[PDB]
Design a protein around this nucleic acid. Sequence first.
RNA 1: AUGAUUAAUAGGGACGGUCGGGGGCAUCAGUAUUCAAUUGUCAGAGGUGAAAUUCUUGGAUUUAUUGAAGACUAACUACUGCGAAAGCAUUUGCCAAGGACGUUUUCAUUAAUCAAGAACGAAAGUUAGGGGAUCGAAGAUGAUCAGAUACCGUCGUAGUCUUAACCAUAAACUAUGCCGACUAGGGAUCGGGUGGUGUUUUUUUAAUGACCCACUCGGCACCUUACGAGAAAUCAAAGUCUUUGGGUUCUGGGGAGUAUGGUCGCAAGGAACUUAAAGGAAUUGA
Lengths: 46, 48, 108, 237
Amino acid sequence: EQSNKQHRKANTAKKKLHTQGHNAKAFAVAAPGKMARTMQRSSDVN
Amino acid sequence: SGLRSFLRKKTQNVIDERKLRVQKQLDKEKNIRKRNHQDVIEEALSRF
Amino acid sequence: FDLDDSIALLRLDDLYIETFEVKDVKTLTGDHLSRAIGRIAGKDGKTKFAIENATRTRIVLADSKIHILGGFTHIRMARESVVSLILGSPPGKVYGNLRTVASRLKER
Amino acid sequence: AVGKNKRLSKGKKGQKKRVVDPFTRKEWFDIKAPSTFENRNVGKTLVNKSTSASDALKGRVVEVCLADLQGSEDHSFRKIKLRVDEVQGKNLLTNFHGMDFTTDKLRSMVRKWQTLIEANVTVKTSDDYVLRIFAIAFTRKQANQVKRHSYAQSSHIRAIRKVISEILTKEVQGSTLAQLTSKLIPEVINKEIENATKDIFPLQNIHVRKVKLLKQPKFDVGALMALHGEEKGKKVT
RNA sequence: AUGAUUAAUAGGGACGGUCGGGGGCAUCAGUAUUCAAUUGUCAGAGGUGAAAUUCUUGGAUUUAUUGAAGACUAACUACUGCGAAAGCAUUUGCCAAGGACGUUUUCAUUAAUCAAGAACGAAAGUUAGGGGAUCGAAGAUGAUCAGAUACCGUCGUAGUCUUAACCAUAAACUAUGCCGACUAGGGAUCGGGUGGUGUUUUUUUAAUGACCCACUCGGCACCUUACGAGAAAUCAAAGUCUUUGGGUUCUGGGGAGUAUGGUCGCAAGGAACUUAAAGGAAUUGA
Ligand SMILES: [Mg+2]
Ligand SMILES: [Mg+2]
Ligand SMILES: [Mg+2]
Ligand SMILES: [Mg+2]
Ligand SMILES: [Mg+2]
Ligand SMILES: [Mg+2]
Ligand SMILES: [Mg+2]
Ligand SMILES: [Mg+2]
Ligand SMILES: [Mg+2]
C-alpha cells in the first residue's frame, strides 16, 4: 500500500523551423493562397 | 494528513495549555481581591 | 512505559530496556526526521502495536528517542523492525516480515 | 568465546605462566583530603611495594563526590578531583585538582522552551594557580508569565555573559585556591551571579559547571602541610 | 542674490535607539575520533543473522594522568530568527552592510515591468599548492552458510578541509511571473513603537531590564469559513457580483512498442568419423 506519486520531468514547434541549417520561415511566398491553386492545376496538367 | 496532522496536534495542545494557565491567573487574582477585602529584632529587620 | 508493563520488571527477572536514537541509525533532519517518527508509529499507532504484538515487547517513542522493553532476544527483534522503518522501508513491507517472525515465535 | 569450535589464534602459542599473585606484592595506602572538606577520610589505594612506591603515588588523581566529603546529599551532583602530592607513613596528602557535575544532573537542567547561557573564563589565583571555570545558567518565566517560553534576546545573553565573567574573574583573582574551594562548597558564587545578572533577566539553575587546573607552580610542601593542619622512628632491637 | 503648487499609507536620502544562528578577518572554548608518552592487569578484542580475514603474551580490548593533528559546533533547537537565493547555530574584538520601527528632518516623480547587458549560485567535478583526524566513490581482500536481520567485514585511492581560478547544475518547489488596489472572522509568536497597571525590581557612581493588559506598524506561520472560484483535490488567492480592459515580461497552439528510400557516428584480424539400437539395466532382473 506504499504508493509514491511519480515525478514529472520537463522540441518546440518554433525550434523545428530552425532545425535545418537555414531558417524555414525565411523562404516563403507572398501569396500562399495563389500558390496552392496553381500547384494543384499544374499537377493535373503534368 | 501525514506530517501535517502531527503539527496540528501540537498547536492544539499548546492552545489548550494556554487556556489552563490563563484561568489559573484569573482564579488567583480573585483570591487576592477576597484577601484584600477581608520581637523587637524582627521589626528592625522587617525591611530586609 | 505504562505502569502495568513496568510491573513486568518486578514480576520477571530477565526483562531489559533497550534505548537508541534515530540519529544513530541515520542522520535525518527537518521533515525527514518527522516523517521517520510517523513511519515508526504508523497511522493510529498501528505500526507500533504490530511490532509490540509480534515481538512480545513494549515500545515508547519519545520524539527521536526509542525505548524497547522486553526480553533480550525479543527487543533485538523489535529493534531490527524499527531500524528498517527508519532507513526508509515502507510499513507494509515491515508488517509482512513481522507476520513471518510472529509465526516462528509460536512454534518455539 | 572460549569454546573449542573457536578458531585457533597465533597469539595462543606461547603464554606466560601465572606464577605470582600480584596482590601479594601490593601495599595499601590511605588517602586524606584537605582541611577545606569536613570528611578527611576518602578511602584507600594500593601500590606495588618499594623495591619506589612514592613515585607511582605522586601524580595520582582520585575523583570523589562532595556528598561523601561533606556528609550531606545536597552535593550529590558535584564531584571533586584530588591529586596526591605528598606521602607520609602510608597517608597520602592530597590537594584540589578540579570540580565537575554528574552527567545526569547536567541533562536534567537542560530543557526546552528556555535559553541556555554558558560562560567560561581562564584566570589565575593569588597562589599563581591557573584555572578555568565554566558557568551555566538558564532563563526562567515570571510568576505571572503566560508565554510558553522564556527566551532572552542575544543582547541580554551577551550582557549576562559579561556580568558572569566579571564575577568569576573577580573572585578567583582576589582569592587563593584553598579560599576558592571554600567558596565552591556553599555555592556563594552562584548566589552572587544571581543577584548581579538578575536585573538584566530572571535566571534559574545558576551553577559553576566545571573547574579545570591548567597549570601549577612549584610544589610547596610547607604550604601543603598547613592546608592539612616530623615523626621519630622506633629503635629496631 | 531672484518664480512657481502638494509633499502620494509612491520612491530616495538623512537622523535615533534597537534587532538578527546576515557577511569578511582575527580570536576563545568544548567534548568526541585517531595517534603517541607514561600507568595496572591479563587472554582474548573486533564484527555479523552466523563467521573469517585482522589486532594480540614485544600485552591487544579495557583503566588512569596527559599531549598532538585535523575536522565539527550536540543537548538548548521551536510549524522561531537573518539573508536576493544558494545558505547561516561556541566566546570575544575589528571592518563595512541591512530589514523593520520612530520622526511636525530632507529631495520632489527621481517609479513598475524588463529584450540587450551584468554579480552570487548547494552537492559533485577540473587545474596548481597546502593539509590529511573521521568517513570514503575506485581497487584489493575475508566469507560465500542461512531470506526479517540478504549484503556484511578489513585495508582504504580520488574526495571530504583550505588557498587562487574553472564548472553554473539540483525534487535550486507555492511542483504556481512581477508591481498596485480591493474583498472574511480568531488568537499565538518575532522585531519596533505608544498607553495603563502592579509584581520582580532598586539606593547621587553611571547604565538601563523581566512579566501582565490594550493598541499600532512590519514578518515567519497557523485555525474556521468562503453570499467568490473550481469538475474535484483545493484556493484570502487559483476571488474581483452571468462574456471577459489597472501596468508590464516570457512561453504554448503520460506508459509501452512497430518500421525506416533519412541524418550523424561505431571494430578487429594476417577439421567432424562411435552399433541409431538389449552390444542394456538389475540389491529392483530373466
Ligand atoms: Mg511622501
Ligand atoms: Mg541606521
Ligand atoms: Mg594496556
Ligand atoms: Mg532566535
Ligand atoms: Mg552549542
Ligand atoms: Mg590537491
Ligand atoms: Mg534547497
Ligand atoms: Mg497582489
Ligand atoms: Mg510588541
